[PDB]
Design a protein around this ligand. Structure first.
Ligand SMILES: [Mg+2]
Lengths: 97, 98, 114, 805, 44, 46, 88, 53
RNA sequence: UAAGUGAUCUAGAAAG
RNA sequence: GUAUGUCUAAAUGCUCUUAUUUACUAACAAAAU
């Protein structure tokens, strides 16, 4: 399990995380992938967390896309990615509450 | 093992003496030694040295040696192949020279 | 606390099978482990030119690549891999495949061998 | 330093004054005339055995690489060249010839120096393309010499007789000299030994060239001289070697020998040399003479140069001795009597048996040495007193001592000996050839230099082995040990220092393996794991350590006289497990020589019989005396003999290999193809297992029973499929690198896990391994990993639960 | 540590036994009215 | 040390991998041969 | 065998690198060898070496040297201040 | 004033530069040669004479 | 007439 | 010796697969008869 990722997703760590989730309510919304279809999330806190995560992602995307080699295609691709992120964020701002 | 786990004959002899086997088995030991000697490709001083050491050590060992010798020329000599026989003879000569 | 550590501490209630099951349940949800292009450190055997900016990355030069499994195996039961690299100057994704028929590699829309 | 020396030489002419050089040349010419030497011509195109010679050279070249698996670029290139040559012999030969003719400028010789920890040696790496040519030259020239009798009987390293054998022969000769041990009329025998110091390092090329011109084709000579005269490189410094022969380049050995011949001639004088040789039409064999009177006449009796370390046996009468002494005194006055002080005596031997310092005997030796020195100019070769040794046999000195080839020999005539005690082991009973009496004794001891070398080798093996697969290390150790023991079989027993070193070296080796396993707890490695062969999963070492070493009164040991009393421990705690010792499976040198003498005679007789009856002598009839002799009888009837008959001057070449290669052969002294396997150690292998209880006992140490097999019969490791067709990706691997299984130590640990990890531990903090019931008494490294692998995915629990179910 | 063409060889005088294990562990699956899929193991 | 890739699984120039590949080929090759002969026979019959 | 462009490149490298750093230079010229490269440099490339011919006196001297240091040719070259092969 | 030296072993910056990178021998070297060649000649002529004899 | 008594080093953990 | 750095506003149970590993790490060390 060299290079840290393996360590992170080693069974023991996972178990610990699960335990934390069970007792006290420590989740790491960084750690899990954000769900595709909203309205399968009855809790508000979770939703908020997800929204926050997406915002963070968007910010990250923004930070990188103004790099100096602007003509490279990665940046262009991200522009679409950025849009997608924005859309997701908007969706997360649903009007149930 | 003792015979073969020993640099000089002297060491081997010492090892043998450590064992302190009964006056019964001395002859047997001698026979074994002889056999070992025969097995080696040509006559080694080692075995002779060992024999000498044994002989000096005690009268019973001398007696045993004598017995072995008697056995050889009488009943065990004709069994051996030539090189082995020659080796044996050489060993005996060495023993008997002094 | 020391790299050659014999036994990692477990809680007093740790049903190992159960734990494993739990992990599995929370592996589909997991971000890492449920993805492709897992990282790797590799030297470059081909010694090739980055097709965009013509940067001549030579033999044995070390990179933090991404190894990914190619689903279409060679023959039947011997896998082949895509091994992504970046050129030092321009950030173009070079990669290569390991087709073991010739005991060597194949370039994959990254650069050219020379 | 070398380049400074060169510069100095350039500045102030050669050390050799021209007149002296001229004189030497004249002497050489005279010698040649006496011998009626046909000079060696330049190789013709349609020379008879040219192709064969080339092939031999190629083979030799291959033998540098055929062993090693790794090859650098240069090595690869060389290999390729060799292959090409093999393919296209005629072309290659032509090319070589052309090179010889024309090429007087050469590529620069880069030098590494090797760490023989006592004293570093140089290694001259010549360019692959020229190297082949050089090899060819070496092959050819030596062959020519052999044919034509360039080198006389006395220059022995060149001869096909093995160093120990040579030594034995020398001893015999010394015993067989007539009236040699008599001390009634004061017949003082002086044995002088010494190195010809810097003999390679102070050859002038011009003089050398001239000398060559006498014996080889002038073109060839020129080629040789230019070749020696190269740009030596090292890292960033480089210098033109303007003076002194380079040892490494292949033919150099021959050149060296030739040079040494001149020195020998100078030492002797002409007439004496001629006498030694014999007549040209039928020359003498080594140390034989056509008559006794002739032998008697001169003061010198026996000569032999060995590789620039000459041995002269002078046999004086009393009157002769006195005169010499007087002369010495005249030369160098001695009122305070400081001739015994600053006199090279042999510290290895003890004060009684070493050369006694009598004011006659000591002086005589010194005088002799002085005379010898006078005989050669210092400029041609440096014969120093610090290098030299003079033993003197007399009425007062009964021990003719000398060090040859790595042996220290003490020839002690039994008429001088007090009580003619039982022949020990180590002693060669020297025999009179006429009467067949064991007339003298000769005690042996491995010379301290050899011991030092051995130690260095051991160190090397140990160092640069933090990785290595335990087994590889073990193998290396075995090789080292085998070299040591096969070289001096008989002569080990006597030397206690060597024994001690062996004990220590072996222990060190063991600890290396134990270092890998991060412990060295003496219980956790019972001799089982080391000496058990690889065919039961062990390292398969070949011990010489479990010997009960001779201890003695160190008070009275170095001093005076000795006897074998009080044995010291030897190497380890044992469970009364007498591990056999390699020495008892090696036939002591005297015995071997006697055997050789017998079976060669027998062979001859057989041949004669065949001739009488008109038949080709079958190899099935000689079976019985098949693996017996020197060379081993079996050297006649191997299926590749015709070509090796043309490989003459091979031993010398092998010896000189040291200067060409980085890691050399540890069995330089012998050579399998010309000699046959001088030892065999399968018996030892067989017996080690027995010593270690039998197979069952060994298994019980191992995890063998845990595999759940009925019995150890028809089990092996790393079997796999056949793998040869797609095996040309490797390089000089010889299809498969090793038939022997390597036993990677990860698995080794597992195999011996049930001994290595065990309850009877001294201080191991008993941790229970993770998710299993497998106690580890201390952190043992690979073992734990293996255990985890075995018991992966909660296997223990599964097992238990399964059982319950 | 380690220890089509040949069809006519099956019917020589030496005794043999084909052994199949395909129908040893057999199951039947069925939905109840509630919805639960009952994987019932059967006699094999 | 020098060439890193030599201590990787994925590296085909690693010897173990090569061996495995050979084995795969050998088995598969054998199978093909077995089938190939049959095919030939069939053709002949036809 | 040495091509001229390659030689030029080598020369350039030497000015860039260092007449005692023959690995990098070798690498730079894909076909030619490290130890060979240095040799080549010694032979042709270095300006201080007088590869060009010289007067009759010099020739005479060279011949004299040849007579009196039997084909000890590197030494002769050194004495001259000339390269070896050319001298030969 | 002291120059700016350039190493034949090191170039930190890699800054290239336009190639900034006794004859008498002792009596012996002639004398020795004379001795040798002359000796050789003597040997030759002497040898010839011997042959004739 | 007298052999064969005793001398017994060690010993693992981290980081590199 | 398993490098490192920037980046951070405050669906539920179910079972079935194994005589393996898309395993990762190379800082560590490098020879023959
Ligand atoms: Mg460090």
């Amino acid at each position: 399990m060299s290079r840290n990722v393996d360590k992170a997703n080693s069974v023991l760590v996972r178990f610990q995380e699960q335990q934390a989730e069970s007792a006290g309510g420590y989740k790491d919304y960084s750690r899990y992938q954000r769900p595709r279809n909203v309205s399968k999330v009855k809790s508000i806190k979770e939703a908020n967390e997800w929204k926050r995560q997406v915002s963070k992602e968007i910010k990250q995307k923004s930070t990188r896309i103004y790099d100096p080699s602007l003509n490279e295609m990665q940046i262009a691709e991200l522009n679409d990615e950025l849009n997608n992120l924005f859309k997701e964020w908007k969706r997360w701002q649903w009007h149930i509450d | 093992l003792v015979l073969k786990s020993s640099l000089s004959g002297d060491e081997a002899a010492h090892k043998l003496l450590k064992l302190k086997i009964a006056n019964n088995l001395k002859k047997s030991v001698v026979d074994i030694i002889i056999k070992s000697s025969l097995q080696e490709s040509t006559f080694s001083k080692f075995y002779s040295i060992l024999s000498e050491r044994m002989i000096t050590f005690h009268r019973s060992w001398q007696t045993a040696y004598n017995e072995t010798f008697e056995q050889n020329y009488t009943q065990d000599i004709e069994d051996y192949e030539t090189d082995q026989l020659r080796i044996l003879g050489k060993f005996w000569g060495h023993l008997i020279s002094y | 606390s020391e790299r050659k550590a014999i036994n990692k501490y477990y809680p007093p209630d740790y049903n190992p099978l159960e734990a494993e099951k739990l992990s599995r349940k929370m592996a589909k949800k997991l971000k890492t482990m449920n993805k492709s292009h897992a990282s790797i450190r590799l030297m470059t055997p081909f010694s090739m030119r980055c097709l965009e900016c013509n940067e001549y990355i030579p033999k044995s030069r070390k990179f933090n690549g991404k190894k990914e499994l190619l689903k279409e195996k060679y023959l039947d039961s011997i896998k082949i891999y895509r091994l992504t690299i970046s050129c030092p100057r321009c950030a173009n994704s070079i990669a290569f495949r390991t087709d073991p028929g010739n005991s060597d590699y194949v370039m994959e829309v990254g650069g050219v061998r020379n | 330093n070398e380049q400074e020396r060169q510069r100095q030489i350039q500045k102030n002419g050669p050390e050799i004054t021209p007149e002296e050089a001229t004189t030497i040349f004249s002497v050489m010419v005279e010698w040649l005339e006496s011998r009626s030497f046909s000079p060696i011509p330049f190789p013709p195109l349609t020379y008879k055995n040219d192709t064969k010679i080339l092939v031999l050279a190629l083979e030799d070249l291959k033998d540098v690489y055929a062993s090693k698996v790794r090859l650098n670029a240069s090595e690869r290139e060389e290999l390729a060249l060799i292959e090409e040559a093999y393919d296209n012999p005629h072309d290659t030969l032509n090319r070589i010839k052309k090179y010889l003719l024309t090429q007087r400028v050469f590529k620069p010789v880069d030098i590494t120096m090797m760490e023989n920890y006592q004293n570093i040696s140089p290694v001259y790496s010549v360019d692959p393309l020229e190297k082949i040519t050089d090899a060819y030259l070496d092959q050819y020239l030596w062959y020519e010499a052999d044919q034509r009798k360039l080198f006389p009987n006395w220059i022995k390293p060149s001869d096909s007789e093995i160093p120990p054998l040579l030594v034995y022969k020398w001893t015999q000769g010394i015993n067989n000299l007539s009236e040699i041990w008599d001390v009634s009329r004061g017949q003082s025998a002086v044995l002088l030994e010494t190195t010809l110091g810097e003999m390679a390092e102070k050859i002038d090329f011009t003089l050398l060239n001239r000398l060559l011109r006498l014996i080889v084709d002038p073109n060839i000579a020129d080629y040789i001289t230019a070749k020696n005269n190269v740009v030596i490189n090292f890292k960033d410094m480089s210098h033109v070697n303007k003076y002194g022969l380079i040892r490494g380049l292949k033919f150099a050995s021959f050149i060296f020998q030739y040079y040494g011949l001149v020195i020998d001639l100078l030492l002797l004088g002409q007439e004496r040399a001629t006498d030694l040789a014999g007549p040209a039409n039928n020359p003498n064999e080594f140390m034989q003479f056509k008559s006794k009177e002739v032998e008697k006449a001169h003061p010198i009796r026996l000569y032999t140069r060995y590789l620039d370390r000459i041995y002269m046996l002078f046999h004086f009468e009393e009157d002769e001795g006195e005169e010499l002494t007087d002369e010495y005194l005249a030369e160098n006055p001695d009122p305070n009597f400081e001739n015994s002080i600053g006199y090279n005596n042999r510290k290895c031997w003890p004060k009684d048996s070493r050369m006694r310092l009598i004011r006659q005997d000591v002086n005589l030796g010194r005088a002799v040495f002085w005379e010898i020195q006078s005989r050669v100019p210092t400029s041609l070769t440096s014969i120093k007193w610090e290098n030299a040794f003079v033993s003197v046999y007399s009425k007062n000195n009964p021990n003719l001592l000398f060090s040859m080839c790595g042996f220290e020999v003490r020839i002690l005539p039994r008429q001088r000996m007090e009580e003619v005690v039982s022949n020990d082991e180590g002693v060669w009973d020297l025999v009179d050839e006429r009467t067949k009496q064991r007339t003298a004794k000769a005690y042996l001891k491995v010379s301290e230099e050899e011991i030092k070398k051995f130690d260095s080798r051991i160190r090397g093996i140990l160092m640069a082995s933090g990785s290595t697969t335990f087994t590889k290390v073990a193998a290396k150790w075995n090789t080292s040990l085998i070299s040591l023991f096969t070289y001096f079989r008989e002569a080990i027993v006597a030397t206690e220092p060597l024994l001690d070193i062996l004990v220590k070296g072996e222990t060190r080796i063991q600890n290396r393996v134990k270092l890998g396993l991060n412990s060295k707890m003496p219980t956790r490695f019972p001799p089982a794991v080391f000496y058990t062969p690889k065919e039961l999963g062990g390292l398969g070492m070949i011990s010489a350590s479990h010997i009960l070493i001779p201890a003695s009164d160190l008070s009275w040991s170095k001093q005076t006289d000795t006897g074998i009393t009080h044995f010291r421990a030897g190497m380890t705690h044992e469970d009364e497990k007498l591990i056999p010792t390699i020495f008892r499976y090696i036939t002591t040198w005297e015995n071997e020589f006697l055997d050789s003498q017998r079976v060669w005679a027998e062979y001859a007789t057989k041949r004669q019989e065949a001739i009488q009856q008109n038949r080709r002598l079958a190899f099935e009839e000689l079976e019985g005396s098949w693996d017996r002799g020197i060379p081993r009888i079996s050297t006649l009837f191997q299926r590749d003999r015709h070509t090796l008959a043309y490989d003459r001057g091979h031993r010398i070449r092998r010896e000189f290999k040291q200067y060409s290669l980085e890691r050399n052969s540890p069995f330089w002294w012998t050579n399998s193809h010309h000699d046959g396997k001088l030892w065999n150690l399968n018996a030892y292998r067989t017996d080690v297992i027995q010593a270690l209880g039998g197979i069952e006992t060994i298994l019980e140490h191992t995890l063998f029973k845990g595999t759940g097999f009925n019995s150890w019969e028809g089990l092996f490791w790393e079997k796999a499929s056949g793998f040869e067709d797609s095996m040309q990706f490797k390089k000089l691997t010889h299809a498969q690198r090793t038939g022997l299984s390597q036993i990677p130590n990860r698995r080794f640990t597992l195999w011996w896990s049930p001994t290595i990890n065990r309850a009877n531990v001294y201080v191991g903090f008993l941790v229970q391994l993770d998710l299993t019931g497998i106690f580890l008494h201390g952190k043992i490294p690979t073992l734990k990993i293996s255990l985890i692998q075995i018991f992966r995915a909660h296997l223990w629990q599964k097992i238990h639960e399964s059982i319950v179910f | 540590i380690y220890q089509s063409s040949n069809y006519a060889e099956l019917f020589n005088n030496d005794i043999k036994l084909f052994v199949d294990d395909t129908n040893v562990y057999r199951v039947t699956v069925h939905k109840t009215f509630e919805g639960n899929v009952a994987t019932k193991a059967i006699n094999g | 040390s020098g060439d890193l890739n030599l201590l990787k699984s994925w590296n085909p120039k690693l010897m173990k991998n090569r061996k495995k590949v050979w084995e795969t080929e050998q088995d598969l090759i054998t199978e093909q041969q077995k089938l190939n002969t049959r095919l030939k026979e069939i053709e002949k019959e036809r | 065998v040495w091509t001229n462009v390659e030689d030029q490149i080598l020369k350039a490298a030497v000015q860039k690198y260092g007449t005692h750093q023959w690995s990098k230079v070798a690498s730079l010229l894909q076909k030619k060898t490290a130890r060979q490269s240095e040799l080549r440099w010694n032979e042709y490339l270095n300006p201080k070496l007088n590869f060009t011919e010289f007067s009759k006196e010099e020739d005479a001297q060279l011949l004299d040297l040849a007579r009196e240091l039997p084909n000890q040719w590197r030494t002769i070259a050194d004495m001259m201040a000339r390269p070896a092969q050319v001298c030969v | 004033k002291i120059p700016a030296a350039v190493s034949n072993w090191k170039n930190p910056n890699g800054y290239t530069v336009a190639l900034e990178r006794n004859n008498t021998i002792n009596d012996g070297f002639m004398k020795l040669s004379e001795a040798l060649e002359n000796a050789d000649k003597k040997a030759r002529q002497e040898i010839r004479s011997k042959m004739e004899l």
